[PDB]
Symmetry: D2
Subunit: 295 residues, 4 copies
């Protein structure tokens, strides 16, 4: 037998950092969960019980805290690139670092219509994520994403003209509820190293904001022919607005809300144009994915 | 042996309702999860296999949908009271109904600075809940609550002057992070029946909004001596602003963020006044509760 | 305003303990999650910011570890009683301690048909729990429970003869699937203090085992007329077998498995006697509860 | 812009099937959660709102139930292959089907030392899974796995001789607790189609059982030098026992249990050889992975 692939590291490292503006008194908080996995010439730890090649996962944890202490933690694309680069430069036998970061929302509170200097609210479980792969000699590959954005529209969604055969019971519809949890990922062109990532720093926050805005606007405004058609329109616009993105991927559950026929009860009318009360379905769910790239 | 207490019903009934303004075209959605448990002269279903006394839990489910079709679902205090009253009036042998409702947030989207007619976002997992107990001959008892409101302040929290003995290792502090998930419940004076609940309908939304606002403002502005002291100030203000509330209960986890001593690494200073990077602790957590009533 | 009720303490304290038999080399592990909440003359911490009355929740955490170090942790009824008694005896102004313990399964592995000295498996998420309330001058009240025991029988369950009215659509049935997650609690007669709890130590494990066995046997063997009727038979037997129990409470979800009519597809027969494939329903669910005591 | 990749289908389809032996009266239940995603010439549904190419996800759901009605559902490797093959044969424009199945445990109850004909228990959340990719013209690729197997050993684990530098604080140890949740996947050689999968049917259950047994025995018996070294021994043995497996992958969290120094309290000794009470850590956790193949 032989080791074909191996990676190891520390997962679920929770980190909080505060920045204190000494002039204005304003404080800003960041909280993240970080995973770092390393690859390299480490096969002998598996095959010969040779621990000399192992950077202990506990040391990886320490490194994450030290790196957060000494560097900015935002945008997460930059922090992940610094962290990944550290490992491949520091350790001769480590040749790739894989860094995943999940950013948790801490939104500044408005009290009496003014922004509070040091109090925050978690407004929603929506996350901003990054995956950074730093590979010695092959640069830095960054995938950025948003996830956990849950939306619903109560009309202006249709689904008709699909294939009908002996397996089909679904009725065509010209008016339905559409609800989904949005997972959207944009993949950056490969960067040659940390200098290049630093040169593009302002684009990271701006592109996240654009991706979010395009998603929300398109969802709200599209008279949707299907999840497939609407998601394609989103990806198209993101690619048009940021030339440094190579691909955009969307993965969307279709969370069903079923009509409830109440006509058995005193002829109560609750279907089609008369539908007011629906039963949200926890499962099953449609799952629709697409990756869109440049011509 | 004897049946000392018994209740039964349907849990986790998900309900969505849409309202369509025909004039303006604006649509408004409500989504809830409902539980209804009944009590009454039902002992023989347990002791003698006498199903004749059982209103099937499936029928309870149907009733919830029918009641939602025929009545407003907001404020949830009113809907729960209508639903509970139904069971005790319809069935001679049922003498109490216990209705729990969890309201899920669907917040209207703003697209280009204007409110969208039919698109919504789940902004946070914060819930608005009610527990309504309708007891034949004893009226309607309503407890209203908010839960899942997660906040953090990065300074202006202290904790010193606590009991120190041979079990104590905790250092006194004059500056710490305070973070919690807020669960707050206000209990209404008993209502004589549905007419009285209807007469107070405008107070329900207003008091929820007041409870939320008082919680957020007090948390943000109090130079907190302890969780205990800050939560008491919240409850005091709510009771002052709504005379129809008898008690306010808060249950608050104290979610710890620990300093990380990095001095072992090149004398790096990250504690006390120099603390910038902290480790959020998933467990254990403080749990602090208080019920405040009138003198 | 006045403090009507208050309690505070530490939740989610995870504890592991190992016992090493020096003779045989056999090791036995216990893992628990513990919550301790205290009550007493602590109102001024809420109303006057007087921290002098507060035993810090961090000290409560330390106490749990120290108590585990110096005492047996099994049966959990004994450990909880020792822990609760500690607080009311040590601190003059603390008059009640509320201890909840959840015991996690670590079952000794059998390797090649022999019990391994030091390797364990988590066989199921079933828990054994205790709630111990130690109240100064009123003794020790103990509720013991099992929870998270999930069972299914594929036949020998019926449900017919229930009330039918204009809200009813459910068909009567003489053969259905019955599946539930069992939560069963037995409440001990009040104990005068720790000496009395110690005198009954062997009864705690034995009664847990009896409760489990009675639950499983009755579920498997009863030709069930309803969840109500079957659960009553369980509680009756437990009370008969242990005179020191005052009440038994069961809380049982009815997890529905629905027939799927496939007759629309080539006349495929999959209902009634021909039912083979079913759709488990995640929600809603029946919820049936009963508390049974002595005549 | 262009569609670079696309797949869509139905996730979280819960299925139960019962088999009734008419002779013996014995019933056997299977419960699974199924996901089917399709690929093919479906780009126009995204780019041109052309729904004519879409097999509705609701029809995919129907197909899963119909296929379960007409075929055995065990071993899951066979069921997944039948289900995937169906889609590529039935629909000319669909060229790949991706089927994921999670099998849930329903273990026959023993009542009074005999196997019950129709009552079952969920003994643990351990799952048996399959991923089947059926690609037109390229055969059937099957990955089988077990997951959610949680184990702990209280001694006979060591970790010393790892790299030490200015980032290292971890002490070497010759005796520690080792606990993990096992995720193990074995990948079968490519099969040419359903006939070939059918010819190997007996190997699927046998290899699952072997993988499980090897995992448990090796974990219990290895005087472990590291997670890396122990997991390699497991994978080596599985590959040796089943020639039709090409690779074995393990992904193992290292769930830490920390010593608690209690010496601050009356010189209490609870570290090194005197360690009895430990604090399980919910996070962070080590994560160690390896893929082992043939020389
Ligand atoms: O078994 C281990 N492997 C590792 O890589 C490691 N790192 N810290 N502790 C560890 N234990
Ligand atoms: O066992 C049951 N008890 C009930 O109360 C009920 N209601 N619907 N189905 C049911 N099954
Ligand atoms: O606000 C606090 N209240 C408490 O009771 C406590 N105990 N430890 N830390 C604490 N912080
Ligand atoms: O938008 C949709 N896309 C689909 O592929 C589908 N299938 N059923 N319903 C559907 N809705
Ligand atoms: Na390197
Ligand atoms: Na009545
Ligand atoms: Na006392
Ligand atoms: Na095909």
């Amino acid at each position: 037998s032989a080791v074909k692939a191996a990676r190891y590291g520390k997962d679920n490292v929770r980190v909080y950092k505060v920045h204190k503006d000494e002039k204005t008194g304003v404080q800003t908080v960041y909280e993240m969960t970080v995973c770092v996995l390393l690859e390299g010439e480490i096969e002998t730890s598996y095959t010969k019980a040779d621990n000399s090649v192992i950077v202990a996962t506990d040391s990886i944890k320490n490194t994450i805290y030290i790196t957060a202490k000494q560097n900015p933690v935002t945008p997460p694309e930059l922090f992940g690139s610094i962290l990944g680069t550290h490992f491949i430069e520091k350790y001769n036998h480590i040749h790739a670092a894989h860094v995943n970061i999940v950013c948790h929302r801490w939104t500044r509170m408005d009290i009496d219509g003014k922004p509070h200097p040091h109090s925050f609210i978690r407004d929603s479980e929506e996350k901003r994520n990054v995956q950074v792969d730093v590979v010695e000699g092959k640069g830095i590959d960054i995938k950025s994403s948003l996830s956990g954005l849950t939306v619903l529209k109560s009309t202006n969604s249709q689904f008709w003209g699909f294939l009908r055969d002996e397996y089909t019971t679904l009725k065509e519809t010209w008016d339905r509820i559409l609800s989904t949890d949005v997972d959207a990922t944009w993949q950056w062109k490969n960067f040659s190293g940390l200098q290049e990532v630093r040169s593009h720093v302002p684009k990271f926050d701006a592109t996240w904001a654009t991706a979010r805005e395009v998603t929300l606007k398109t969802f709200a405004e599209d008279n949707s022919a299907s999840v497939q058609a609407t998601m394609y329109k989103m990806a198209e616009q993101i690619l048009a607005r940021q030339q440094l993105i190579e691909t955009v991927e969307y993965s969307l559950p279709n969370k069903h809300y079923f009509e409830i026929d109440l006509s058995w009860h005193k002829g109560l009318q609750n279907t089609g144009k008369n539908a007011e009360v629906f039963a949200p379905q926890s499962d099953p769910n449609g799952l629709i994915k697409c990756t869109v790239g440049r011509s």
